[PDB]
RNA sequence: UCCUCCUAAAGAGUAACGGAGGAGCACGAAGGUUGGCUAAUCCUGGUCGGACAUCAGGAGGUUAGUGCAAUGGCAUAAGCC
RNA sequence: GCCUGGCGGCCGUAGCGCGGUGGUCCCACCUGACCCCAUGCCGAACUCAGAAGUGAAACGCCGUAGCGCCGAUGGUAGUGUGGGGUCUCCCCAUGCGAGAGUAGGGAACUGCCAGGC
């Protein structure tokens, strides 16, 4: 079962990350689409938010779920982060491999400044 | 290749006058042919086993591996994944390559035989055929002959019942008999 | 043990050793081996029986 | 058959008889044999009633027993001082309370039924009684 | 169809329990019908001999309960593992 | 025989209990295996490879139902 | 001498030639790690042929495994690669 | 307020088993893998390229309250503390009081964020 699989690959990875804390990024994947959200370090808020969904740049897309699109959200959460003074953040990979459209986001994000 | 192809149109695509879905998307397919070779006497050293795989290669188009044992067989040695026979399991197109070898070119040393039965059961549809041996292809030269090895076959597929498989045995052109 | 006793010198030119017992019964080929010598602070092979 | 089997102990407690039992009525069939009395009941006892009430039901319907022993009777050798382990198994044993239900019947009239477990009011360390499912 | 008359008890646990058994009466409950449990004293033998012909759970009782009454089904019985005349009853409303 | 010998001590050690703690170190038990009945969750942290949890803070013991995975596990007390 | 359960009293130690069983050596690998992976048992069916015996499908599940007896974590696997 | 999604809190009284309903926008299956990457062989998996079909499987929401689970009240089991007995559990006074069953409950909730309404 690929939603039970997804879950044996990340538990150890968010039983470090809880370990760091702070502000956070997550990702969410799914084919035909990927977001991502900024979340605060009380679990109470959110602080960034950025899509392919958003209606803005849905329209630019040859596909909704491209790579291509995860950087240009990527450059797009770096940018909005930027603008409200966010650092030092803690990147969740979200139960997938830093090579596929998560580190395709997240690496275009940290060339736009986003550390991580 | 022009078997999978029949399978892409010809086969349980009408299926809804004959059998009760919800979804046209309930159709049978074929998952996989995971295949049997057996070491026999050479059990008790099987360096030869990437020799034999090499030669069951030469019908398939899979790429060789050898079957790790299970249980352990025997007083033979066996331990854990002990390497001890060959399976080289067949998925999508590579299914249909097989058989369009077997019984088509591969033929000099089958047994009398004429039709397989249609109402064979299993519980979920996934037939058999009996042919023992690689059965040989023929060569320009050959020179191929000696013990020529062993092959067993059971398909796996997504039906649920013996004569819902029974619709699905549509799919290759071995003598089978209603 | 009857698996016997392997000593060997670093490739650092130091006098200080490495001494394991690394039994030849099933698996005869020779121990060659990195460990972190002690004297230099650095990451060497050590060989060579006795 | 009416022994403990599949255990990994061999040897118990001689233990203390507290129990106040859940085996207080006819479970399946609809005439019994109730203790309404308190002590041990040995293998041996209920052989001597089996042996009893198959006289009066001597070809008539099955029998049902729902008391078991769950302990051995160990007892220690004689020629030998006290220590050097538990002793050496002689009976097996259950205890019994007065509320607990022995044996069933149902295949036979209740006047049948009567007619053995009348004949169990006898060879036995309680003074047993006879009962019925009745209606209520 | 079978009255009984039910008092109300504002006692409860083993010691009040014993001492109540030990009398004409035995401990007994009326509940459910969307109105709280109520805790009451029974006739020790005059509600077994009733329940013993069976009728009383298939029929609805015309108890006497503080007074008054109010209609109940028989719902439950416990009973002791040697003493014959009842331990505890339950009813619920009808 | 007879049985034999019958080891000493066996012993087997309790501090994760009550508002344990308070100056400098919180504990758990000595069980040979340990990951979620007296463990820590979230935040917090104690535990290596010889599962006794002993976690370094002045915060006192509290309990508290439930956490990940249904375990009970064991929570500091801010002052 | 070391080591384990039950008996042994819901804090904690604990008797008995009480109920019952082991260790006295191994492992460069089963060690370090990033990633990937997931049984037993019962059942159905077997082949040129079986003193033993193939890989699937059906049931099932912290019932397999962990170098070694014994118990308990365990898939985040600490199980194997 | 609701539909879906992600997350934090919460972690199965969200489990077991049998249905309804819907994919608009979600979502999963599904489609392609001659060209990035990948498989002890295998496009199953990983990854890349996607919208032709399914609404079945799964998923979300809801229904069926039989089981697991919560749970009155009463009673029983057990006993803090005193006193007694033809007796090793049994009785009195006083404090406490299960577990399992019954009524009743239970088929996860909710804030932040973007989007469907």
């Not at chain 4, 097996?92 to 004949?119: H, N, S, T």
């Amino acid at each position: 079962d690929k939603k039970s699989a997804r879950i044996r690959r990340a538990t150890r990875a968010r039983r470090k990350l809880q370990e760091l804390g702070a502000t956070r990024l997550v990702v969410h994947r799914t084919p035909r689409h990927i977001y991502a959200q900024v979340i605060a370090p009380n679990g109470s808020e959110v602080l960034v938010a950025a899509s392919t969904v958003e209606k803005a740049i849905a329209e630019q897309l040859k596909y909704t779920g491209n790579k291509d699109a995860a950087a240009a959200v990527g450059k797009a959460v770096a940018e909005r982060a930027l603008e409200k003074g966010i650092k030092d953040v803690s990147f969740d990979r979200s139960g997938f491999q830093y090579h596929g459209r998560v580190q395709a986001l997240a690496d275009a994000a940290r060339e736009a400044g986003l550390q991580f | 290749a022009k078997l999978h192809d029949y399978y892409k149109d010809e086969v349980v695509k009408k299926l809804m006058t004959e059998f009760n879905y919800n979804s046209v998307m309930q159709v049978p397919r074929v998952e996989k042919i995971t295949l049997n070779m057996g070491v026999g006497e050479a059990i008790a050293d099987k360096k030869l086993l990437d020799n034999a795989a090499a030669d069951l290669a030469a019908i398939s188009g899979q790429k060789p591996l050898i079957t790790k044992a299970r249980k352990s067989v025997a007083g033979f040695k066996i331990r854990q994944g002990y390497p001890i026979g060959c399976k080289v399991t067949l998925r999508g197109e590579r299914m249909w390559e097989f058989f369009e070898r077997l019984i088509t070119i591969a033929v000099p040393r089958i047994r009398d035989f004429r039709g397989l039965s249609a109402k064979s059961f299993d519980g979920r549809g996934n037939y058999s055929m009996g042919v023992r041996e690689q059965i040989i292809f023929p060569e320009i030269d050959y020179d191929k002959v000696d013990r020529v090895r062993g092959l067993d076959i059971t398909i796996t597929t997504t039906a649920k019942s013996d004569e819902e498989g029974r619709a699905l045995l549509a799919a290759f052109d071995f003598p089978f008999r209603k | 043990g009857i698996r016997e006793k392997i000593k060997l010198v670093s490739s650092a030119g130091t006098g200080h050793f490495y001494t394991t017992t690394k039994n030849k019964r099933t698996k005869p080929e020779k121990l060659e081996l990195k460990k972190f010598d002690p004297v230099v602070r650095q990451h060497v092979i050590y060989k060579e029986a006795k | 058959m009416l022994q403990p089997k599949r255990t990994k102990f061999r040897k118990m407690h001689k233990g203390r008889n507290r129990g106040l039992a859940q085996g207080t009525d006819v479970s399946f069939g609809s005439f019994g044999l109730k203790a309404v009395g308190r002590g041990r009941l040995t293998a041996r006892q209920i052989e001597a009633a089996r042996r009893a009430m198959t006289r009066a039901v001597k070809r008539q319907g099955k029998i049902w027993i729902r008391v078991f022993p769950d302990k051995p009777i160990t007892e220690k050798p004689l020629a030998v001082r006290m220590g050097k382990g538990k002793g050496n198994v002689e009976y097996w044993v259950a205890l019994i309370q007065p509320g607990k239900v022995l044996y069933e019947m149902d295949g036979v009239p209740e006047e049948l039924a009567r007619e053995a477990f009348k004949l169990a009011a006898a060879k036995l360390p309680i003074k047993t009684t006879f009962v019925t499912k009745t209606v209520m | 169809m079978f009255t009984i008359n039910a008092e109300v008890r504002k006692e409860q646990g083993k010691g009040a329990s014993r001492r109540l058994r030990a009398a004409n009466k035995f401990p007994a409950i009326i509940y459910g019908g969307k109105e709280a449990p109520l805790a009451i004293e029974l006739d020790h033998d005059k509600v077994m001999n009733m329940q013993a012909k069976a009728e009383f759970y298939s029929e609805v009782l015309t108890i006497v309960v503080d007074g008054k009454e109010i209609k109940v089904k028989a719902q439950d019985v416990q009973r002791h593992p040697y003493k014959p005349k009842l331990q505890h009853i339950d009813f619920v409303r009808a | 025989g007879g049985s034999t010998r019958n080891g000493r001590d066996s012993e087997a050690k309790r501090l994760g209990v009550k508002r344990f703690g308070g100056e400098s170190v919180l504990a758990g038990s000595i069980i040979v295996r340990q990951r979620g009945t007296k463990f820590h969750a979230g935040a917090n942290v104690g535990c290596g490879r010889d599962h006794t949890l002993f976690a370094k803070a002045d915060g006192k013991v509290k309990f508290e139902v439930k956490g990940p995975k249904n375990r009970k596990f064991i929570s500091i007390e801010a002052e």
